[PDB]
Amino acid sequence: YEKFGKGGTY
Amino acid sequence: PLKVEKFATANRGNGLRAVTPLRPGELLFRSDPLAYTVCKGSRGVVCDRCLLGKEKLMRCSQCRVAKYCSAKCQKKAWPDHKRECKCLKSCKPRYPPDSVRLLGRVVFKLMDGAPSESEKLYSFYDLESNINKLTEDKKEGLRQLVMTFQHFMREEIQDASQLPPAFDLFEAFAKVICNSFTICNAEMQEVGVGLYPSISLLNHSCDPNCSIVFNGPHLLLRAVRDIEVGEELTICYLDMLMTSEERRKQLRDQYCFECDCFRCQTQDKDADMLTGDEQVWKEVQESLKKIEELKAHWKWEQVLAMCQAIISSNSERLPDINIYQLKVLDCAMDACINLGLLEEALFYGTRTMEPYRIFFPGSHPVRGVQVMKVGKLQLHQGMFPQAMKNLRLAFDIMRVTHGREHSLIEDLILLLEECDANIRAS
Numbered sequence A: 001y002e003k004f005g006k007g008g009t010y
Numbered sequence B: 001p002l003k004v005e006k007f008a009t010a011n012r013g014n015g016l017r018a019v020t021p022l023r024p025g026e027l028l029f030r031s032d033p034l035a036y037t038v039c040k041g042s043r044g045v046v047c048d049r050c051l052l053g054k055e056k057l058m059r060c061s062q063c064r065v066a067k068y069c070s071a072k073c074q075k076k077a078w079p080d081h082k083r084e085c086k087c088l089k090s091c092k093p094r095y096p097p098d099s100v101r102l103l104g105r106v107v108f109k110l111m112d113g114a115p116s117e118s119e120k121l122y123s124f125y126d127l128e129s130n131i132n133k134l135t136e137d138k139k140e141g142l143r144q145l146v147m148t149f150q151h152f153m154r155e156e157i158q159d160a161s162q163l164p165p166a167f168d169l170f171e172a173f174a175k176v177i178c179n180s181f182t183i184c185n186a187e188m189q190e191v192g193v194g195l196y197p198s199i200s201l202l203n204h205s206c207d208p209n210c211s212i213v214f215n216g217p218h219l220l221l222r223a224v225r226d227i228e229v230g231e232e233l234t235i236c237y238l239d240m241l242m243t244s245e246e247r248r249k250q251l252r253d254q255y256c257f258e259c260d261c262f263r264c265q266t267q268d269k270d271a272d273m274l275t276g277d278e279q280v281w282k283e284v285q286e287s288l289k290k291i292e293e294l295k296a297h298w299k300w301e302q303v304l305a306m307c308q309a310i311i312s313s314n315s316e317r318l319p320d321i322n323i324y325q326l327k328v329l330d331c332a333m334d335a336c337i338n339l340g341l342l343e344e345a346l347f348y349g350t351r352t353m354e355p356y357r358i359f360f361p362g363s364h365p366v367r368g369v370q371v372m373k374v375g376k377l378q379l380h381q382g383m384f385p386q387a388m389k390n391l392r393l394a395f396d397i398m399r400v401t402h403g404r405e406h407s408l409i410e411d412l413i414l415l416l417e418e419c420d421a422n423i424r425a426s
Ligand SMILES: Nc1ncnc2c1ncn2[C@@H]1O[C@H](CSCC[C@H](N)C(=O)O)[C@@H](O)[C@H]1O
Pocket: B011, B012, B013, B014, B015, B126, B127, B128, B130, B178, B179, B200, B201, B202, B203, B204, B205, B254, B255, B256, B257, B258, B259, B260
């Protein structure tokens, strides 16, 4: 018990 | 009849290409997630189901972890929440990484016999894992996520024999890491993460011909340029305000490839992004780490206080086009909008307009929304000709990036009609 994933706020 | 098709690329694995010629704004595909979850910073801020913010959310009474805007969202979310409820309850206040919670929802979807519309073009088992390209530090991190999943899920699943035999937990996390999508709300705040396997067929370009936008969990894929028959369809996996070195590092580390696109090979826009003295802007870049973490948790007062200190102290030295100063202005604008400081929000937002025109060329949904926010602020502060110009510009962008299938277009049309009415009233 970090940041993954396509795309985002910009 | 589909306008897109899977094919085998030469060197990039599988991809998606156009079956017919495509025009800007054309809707190519739309998908709900195979599975999704609210993200760490937004949990308890937005509804678990619809990913909308509300001042009052109601908790699941069984775990007190999931939160919903309405009894309707709570009931519709129950099939997806039923098997994780006991798991979330066990570990409260401790909470699993987003990837673990997401994969906990995926595994039970895989045991559905009905075909998932989200898997029409490509399935979860088709997804690229890059398992033979992973660095040793990455494999160690995945082994840690496996152990965390096994602990988090123990009330529901104690052994691999309770999941499909083709499923492998280590390889599943590798797939989750390079195939998940960040879900943004209408204001482009990150609220969630999901798997959309058919959309995962799109390869990356830093100058893509397609764009995705979210309406709640629902994903729309649109062409943003003319596209010829047989042309490969691409999206940008990354934030646009990144230099070519930053982009190449993230794509190598997360996605296991070296980006050879035209912009990375030519350092396109790097000089503009880095305008000013590095001794000055490196300090802003460092401060942004904390700012972006506070913004992720919706702590707007704290965001705004940190941003104001940077913006006032650099005013004599650092131009707004520098990407680190630009991100601080954008964080400041959004904090002010969320806090109701509308005059101050417009001051910061106006300063982002020309840098956004340069760094989001063509039709990009992030610029469309930013221009709409500025036009909306101008309208309510009574600057009608300026607001009308920006709201018209936003509509030109967003008819391509959002389209009539996205509800933000109806909101923009209402603002355009209101602005026009004030102009006529003189
Ligand atoms: N521009 C690009 N150059 C090289 N490989 C790319 C690429 N864009 C995406 N990829 C590959 O595609 C993966 C992300 S998923 C995109 C679909 C994938 N090609 C598949 O066959 O399922 C990346 O991790 C990398 O393997």
